[PDB]
Amino acid sequence: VQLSETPAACSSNPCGPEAAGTCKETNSGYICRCNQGYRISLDGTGNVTCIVRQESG
Numbered sequence: 001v002q003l004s005e006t007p008a009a010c011s012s013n014p015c016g017p018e019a020a021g022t023c024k025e026t027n028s029g030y031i032c033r034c035n036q037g038y039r040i041s042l043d044g045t046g047n048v049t050c051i052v053r054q055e056s057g
Contacts, residue, residue: 020038
């Protein structure tokens with residue numbers, strides 16, 4: 001959620017763009033909900049990010 005200056009957690013674009021996946025601040029910090037055609041991936045450092053599944057599935 002975009003607070004004002006830094007959205008916090010979503011401030012680094014965890015799931016990338018909105019079209020890729022939406023981020024929600026949770027107990028653990030944040031989670032990523034990828035849209036139809038995208039998937040969850042840990043990008044090397046274990047960060048929860050959203051990547052393309054292929055195109056639209």
